[PDB]
RNA sequence: GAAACUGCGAAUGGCUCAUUAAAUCAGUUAUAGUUUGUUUGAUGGUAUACUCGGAUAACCGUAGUAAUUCUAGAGCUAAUACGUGCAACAAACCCCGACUUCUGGGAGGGGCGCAUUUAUUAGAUGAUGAUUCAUGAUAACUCGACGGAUCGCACGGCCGCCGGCGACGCAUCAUUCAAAUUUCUGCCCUAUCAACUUUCGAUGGUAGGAUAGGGGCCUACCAUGGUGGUGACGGGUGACGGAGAAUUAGGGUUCGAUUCCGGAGAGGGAGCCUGAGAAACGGCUAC
């Protein structure tokens, strides 16, 4: 049985193939989100602790959390949920697909595993490097949290810190910087002010029409009283 | 006397337990019996204004409105609770022979307690909302056979 | 059907559009708007079939997307916008203004109006009743809601609306003796004065109208539109002056024109 | 599913009507709420035609009740269902439906009566207004004898399966006498 | 600017005529018995702010499976996605009510946006042929998906504050686009079809439930009704209805699957999700 081991801290992924029956047994009968101790499933894995995050069977059917068995079942699934991506399918469409239970059994092709606690040794290609984050924060508050700014601190200066610089195929220099979202600009303040002024003018127009109608009705009643005075 | 059901029977939106009762107020106010003119030149029978019956399907004291067709006819059956069969008699022209044939239509109509009717009376019914599976009309005026 | 229809078959189009039978499988289905679909003249028809400014559907789109056409003072870019009776169609580039009136044959005719006369429309009051907050409000047959109307204005009245200011500047009470134009039925486009109003409880109300030359016709209340206080209409009328002609007199006119 | 169509019925002549169309969604019915009197309040959102909302009460224990002669409305706990005119099954199951007769807590109405009239069933202005109100004050002694037990007979006027609420009025007068006779005959 | 998220559409159109004989459908009504994305018009006040939070796609790279817009795990990052949250301020009105000198005054406290539900009350002698109508007031009620944390262009006026033209979005009413239900009258042959319907809804009544809304539509109880030689009920149709078509001195006879209107179906049944709108089938679930 293959193990697709991922190290979320360094962002490295590596597939490990374990065929010995004992090491496989130290994972059998376990469920998704349950954690395993690496010392059980080999020599190189001492200290390491692995979290079972799912897997696929010999027919490529994913394991689902909460099914509570080792076999295959058919479930009516919703789009965007695990075991049913539903790409190109209509909104509100359900489908009955074959999913495997959350319990690890001998009928699994692969176990998706995650490293939660780093062991005493180092795994080649897994914990011996660090793949950097592809993109930096884009929302202003996230930028402030990242660089520990406070109120009245400008976030743009720090956007220039993690610009991606590369050469075009022609050979010219190109720099990429994200557009900051949720950033307060004078246009935003003007928009809020215009909203407030719209409320102002709504109220003023309402009062004006109400007062004019009241004056017209009062004049009409006075004219009726003039008729009565005949 | 009118409380013949397993439930109290009241005119909707009329407060009977009012403390400031008064008789000079309009119908439905101060605990007064509610009644209405159906319109279309039809007088409200005095036994509906002075009645004690509670009929939600009454045209004069109930909640139904008269709108649509106004059909005359003869009482053909009066053996149901507040519902009678109105038979309409008419001549159907036959084009090829240039003659007529007699044809009839049986129209179920709800009759309120303000009218007492017998088979053979000339009745005037007005169209209302569906009151049951087959009833879409309310008796508005009853003319005895004699 | 499981929902609204999006297409108008050309045969099923209103006959006053004068669409030809072999021009295609379809007619422009009027969009929802101020006027009913069966009683309007869509903008695409006005621009292409009537004014000849555009020659195709796509050319109508090109003209309208340039923001060249205002309906009752407001720019419309929808080609199937349901322009209707008394609407002002203005093109503030060629400096031309049009009032959508009916000719005596029941067909909408673009009537040229002055710049000052294009500053108001005539609307027919549909109902007067209390809105929220107890505020009185008026609504018309061309889809407008006007709050705080004059209390002397009742249903079936004609109000004069200034398009620039969006207020009732004057109104006409629906009375016997007021000049009217028929907007529906076989007498569409006929202009006369009301002689009497025959009311019948529970059914439609009949209006008796007599035109200037003395011909008498009758039509329902929902098809009568007051256009002036007395015998003088508030708007200008097309060449026919609302006086319907019998086919014999039309042939007389054609013979006289050919002879000249 | 549950339908509301006249298709499946016999004709008024008794003749059977052959079906000419499958069931449409615009003529559906849904299963009854069967609102129970219980202190485990559950009201569910029912998405209905037009994208509108219907509130489906499953369990209710509190309602908004009006004392019409006093023109006062108070939120009171529902204690028991005592009379139903359509089915005593709904009485034993404690089902809350429109026009059901229920026991409601009289404590809020006692409190309001004490505050407003000064009568249990500190200023010159307050005492003057209280004496003005107490002049002409008349209770009906039936509402009083049930106030003695702290339970008022009430009629559910709202539809719990539609609006998610169990609202009503306090029974008075001839309706009160009618329903007391029914409950004593039970 | 690809991709992708978000939004909208895919309920139209096209095809067919199997079922269906007062049923569809036609003309003619009605909604005072309802829903209605959108358009058009009007309306919107009492609930860190110089602007909140956590995810996720595309991307990237570990995969599984014989395989499918079959599918799992890891690393990132957006919003008009999702979720929260100040919501520019106000009068009026209602209730309680310390004190006051008092048939009152009155501090203070509570309620009060819009929507929802119930109840009381006004609506006279604003509206309709007609409404306990529109609508107002009051008491409460609801664990309210409401009351803008959005975007473009221009960017000026006063000394930081104000500021235009738009776009998108929320809610209410009206309008428009419509549907649903519904009134009356009208259909071929057959009596070698004369009685039919009603346990288990048949006809009506009461109270509910359900529905967008009327209604035996369904439930409980009650009554015994309802249709029928003016042909009920049943059977036949190589029967979808109509506009129409052929032939016609007149009268008539026969046809009307097919391009316009209406209906119905997507192998046969049934059931649904999404959605304003489908019992959808170039959507799903089952037999
Ligand atoms: K339909
Ligand atoms: K859609
Ligand atoms: K019809
Ligand atoms: K209903
Ligand atoms: K019933
Ligand atoms: K939609
Ligand atoms: Mg932004
Ligand atoms: Mg279609
Ligand atoms: Mg009202
Ligand atoms: Mg009922
Ligand atoms: Mg057939
Ligand atoms: Mg045909
Ligand atoms: Mg065939
Ligand atoms: Mg064909
Ligand atoms: Mg067709
Ligand atoms: Mg279909
Ligand atoms: Mg086939
Ligand atoms: Mg289907
Ligand atoms: Mg196909
Ligand atoms: Mg299709």
């Amino acid at each position: 049985m293959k193990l697709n081991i991922a190290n979320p801290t360094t962002g490295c992924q590596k597939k490990v193939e374990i065929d010995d029956d004992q090491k496989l047994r130290n994972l059998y009968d376990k469920r998704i989100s349950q954690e395993v101790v690496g010392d059980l499933l080999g020599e190189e894995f001492k200290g390491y602790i692995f979290k079972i995050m799912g897997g696929c069977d010999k027919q490529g059917f994913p394991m689902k959390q909460g099914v509570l068995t080792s076999g295959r079942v058919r479930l009516l699934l919703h789009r965007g949920t695990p075991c049913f991506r539903g790409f190109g399918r209509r909104n509100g469409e359900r489908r009955r697909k074959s999913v495997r239970g959350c319990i690890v059994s001998q009928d699994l092709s692969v176990i998706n595993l995650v490293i939660v606690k780093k062991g005493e040794n180092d795994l080649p290609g897994l914990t011996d490097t660090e793949k950097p984050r592809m993109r930096g924060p884009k929302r202003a508050s996230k930028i402030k949290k990242l660089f520990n700014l406070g109120k009245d601190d400008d976030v743009r200066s720090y956007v220039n810190t993690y610009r991606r610089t590369f050469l075009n195929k022609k050979g010219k220099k190109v720099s990429k910087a994200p557009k900051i979202q949720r950033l307060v600009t004078p246009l935003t303040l003007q928009r809020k002010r215009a909203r407030i002024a719209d409320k102002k003018k709504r109220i003023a127009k309402k009062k004006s029409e109400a007062a004019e109608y009241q004056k017209l009705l009062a004049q009409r009643l006075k004219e009726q009283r003039d008729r009565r005075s005949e | 006397a009118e409380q013949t059901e397993k439930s109290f029977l009241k005119q909707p939106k009329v407060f009977l337990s009012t403390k400031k009762a008064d008789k000079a107020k309009r119908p439905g106010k101060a605990g007064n019996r509610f009644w209405k003119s159906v319109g279309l030149g039809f007088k409200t029978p005095r036994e509906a204004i002075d009645g004690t019956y509670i009929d939600k399907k009454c045209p004069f004291t109930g909640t139904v409105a008269i709108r649509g067709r106004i059909i005359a006819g003869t009482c053909h059956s009066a053996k149901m609770n507040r519902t009678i069969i109105v038979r309409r008699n008419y001549l159907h022209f036959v084009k090829k022979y240039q003659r007529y044939e007699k044809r009839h239509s049986n129209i179920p109509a709800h009759i309120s307690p303000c009218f007492r009717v017998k088979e053979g009376d000339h009745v005037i019914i007005g169209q209302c909302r569906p009151l049951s599976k087959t009833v879409r009309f309310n008796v508005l005026k009853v003319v005895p056979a004699g | 059907a499981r929902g609204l229809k999006k297409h108008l078959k050309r045969l099923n189009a209103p006959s006053h559009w004068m669409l030809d039978k072999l021009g295609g499988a379809f007619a422009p289905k009027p969009s929802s708007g101020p006027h009913k679909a069966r009683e309007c003249l869509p903008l695409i028809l006005i621009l292409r079939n009537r004014l000849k400014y555009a020659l195709t559907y796509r050319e109508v789109q090109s003209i309208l997307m340039q923001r060249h056409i205002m309906v009752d003072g407001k720019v419309r870019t929808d080609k199937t916008y349901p322009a209707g009776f008394m609407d002002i169609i203005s093109i503030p580039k060629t400096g031309e203004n049009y009032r959508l009136l009916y000719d005596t044959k029941g067909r909408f005719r673009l009537h040229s109006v002055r710049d000052e006369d294009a500053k108001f429309k005539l609307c027919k009051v549909r109902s007067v009743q209390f809105g929220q907050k107890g505020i009185p409000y008026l609504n018309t047959y061309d889809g407008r809601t006007i709050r705080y109307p004059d209390p002397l204005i009742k249903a079936n009245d004609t109000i004069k609306l200034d398009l620039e200011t969006n207020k009732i500047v004057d109104f006409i009470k629906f009375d016997v003796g007021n000049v009217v134009m028929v907007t529906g039925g076989r007498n569409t486009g006929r202009v006369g004065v009301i002689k009497n109003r025959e009311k019948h409880k529970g059914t439609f109300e009949t209006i008796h109208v007599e035109d200037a030359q003395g011909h008498q016709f009758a039509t329902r209340l929902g098809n009568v539109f007051t256009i002036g206080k007395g015998t003088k209409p508030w708007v200008s009328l097309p060449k026919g002056k609302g006086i319907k002609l019998t086919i014999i007199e039309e042939q007389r006119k054609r013979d006289a024109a050919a002879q000249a | 599913g549950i339908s509301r169509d006249s298709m499946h019925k016999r004709r008024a002549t008794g003749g059977k009507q052959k079906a000419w169309r499958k069931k449409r969604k615009y003529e559906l019915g849904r299963q009854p709420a069967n609102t129970k009197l219980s202190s485990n309040k559950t009201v569910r959102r029912v998405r209905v035609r037009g994208g509108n909302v219907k509130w489906r009460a499953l369990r209710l224990d509190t309602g908004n009740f009006s004392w019409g002669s006093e023109a006062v409305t108070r939120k009171t706990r529902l204690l028991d269902v005592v009379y139903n005119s359509s089915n005593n099954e709904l009485v034993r199951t404690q089902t809350l439906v429109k026009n059901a007769i229920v026991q409601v807590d009289a404590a809020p109405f006692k409190q309001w009566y004490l505050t407003h009239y000064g009568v249990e069933i500190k200023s010159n202005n307050v005492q003057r207004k209280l004496e003005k109100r107490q002049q002409g004050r008349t209770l009906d002694s039936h509402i009083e004898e049930q106030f003695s037990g702290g339970r008022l007979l009430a009629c559910i006027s709202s539809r719990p399966g539609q609006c998610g609420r169990a609202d009503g009025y306090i029974l008075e007068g001839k309706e009160l006498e009618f329903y007391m006779r029914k409950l004593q005959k039970k």
Side-chain angles (χ1 to χ4, degrees), chain D residues 166-185:
Chain D
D167 293 3
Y169 46 111
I170 304 292
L171 296 176
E172 332 199 59
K174 293 179 179 179
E175 195 165 342
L176 185 48
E177 310 161 14
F178 175 96
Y179 278 116
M180 264 170 316
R181 291 193 297 274
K182 288 294 190 293
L183 288 168
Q184 81 192 30
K185 291 187 317 161

Side-chain angles (χ1 to χ4, degrees), chain D residues 3-69:
Chain D
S3 200
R4 292 181 303 110
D5 60 323
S6 290
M7 191 136 264
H8 69 291
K9 294 292 272 171
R10 294 195 158 271
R11 282 197 185 90
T13 69
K16 254 198 271 193
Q17 330 186 79
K18 293 179 179 179
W20 61 274
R21 63 181 198 188
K22 277 177 177 69
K23 300 166 166 176
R24 301 277 186 263
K25 186 263 175 182
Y26 64 58
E27 69 199 15
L28 58 69
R30 303 187 188 90
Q31 257 194 117
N34 285 335
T35 311
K36 310 277 92 142
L37 193 161
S38 167
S39 66
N40 191 262
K41 189 178 170 185
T42 279
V43 176
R44 307 235 158 101
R45 228 184 164 280
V46 171
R47 188 283 185 192
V48 307
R49 189 173 180 89
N52 296 305
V53 175
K54 256 186 205 172
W55 290 105
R56 185 132 277 150
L58 296 183
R59 270 161 334 270
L60 274 187
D61 64 62
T62 290
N64 189 46
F65 286 94
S66 271
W67 189 359
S69 304

Side-chain angles (χ1 to χ4, degrees), chain C residues 2-132:
Chain C
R2 300 200 310 285
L4 294 156
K5 289 324 179 62
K6 296 308 174 186
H7 302 91
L8 187 58
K9 291 301 181 66
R10 196 175 188 92
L11 279 189
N12 184 30
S15 64
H16 53 105
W17 292 355
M18 301 179 272
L19 288 198
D20 69 28
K21 157 168 73 142
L22 298 180
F26 289 108
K29 206 206 181 199
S31 66
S32 46
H35 305 267
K36 289 199 145 293
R38 285 292 165 177
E39 188 161 68
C40 82
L41 191 58
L43 270 187
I44 172 150
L45 265 39
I46 298 164
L47 271 192
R48 167 188 62 174
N49 304 62
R50 298 286 189 271
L51 292 188
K52 307 298 185 182
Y53 283 128
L55 300 161
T56 42
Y57 185 83
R58 151 185 317 160
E59 226 158 41
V60 160
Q61 200 188 47
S62 281
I63 290 184
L64 279 168
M65 230 42 51
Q66 273 164 270
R67 290 178 81 76
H68 279 335
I69 305 305
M70 293 178 351
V71 179
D72 281 297
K74 295 214 217 162
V75 167
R76 300 305 169 183
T77 68
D78 204 82
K79 33 212 175 202
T80 60
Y81 187 77
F85 182 69
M86 276 279 183
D87 282 3
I88 302 285
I89 295 89
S90 79
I91 317 165
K93 195 196 203 308
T94 88
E96 245 300 280
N97 293 261
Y98 294 112
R99 203 182 291 282
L100 267 190
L101 303 150
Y102 285 114
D103 74 29
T104 42
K105 300 200 176 181
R107 301 151 334 183
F108 276 121
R109 285 297 172 211
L110 295 153
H111 178 69
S112 203
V113 296
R114 293 182 183 174
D115 289 345
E116 293 177 350
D117 282 345
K119 293 179 179 179
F120 72 94
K121 66 171 324 187
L122 288 196
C123 308
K124 183 182 181 181
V125 182
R126 170 200 312 263
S127 46
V128 187
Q129 65 272 291
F130 281 22
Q132 225 201 6

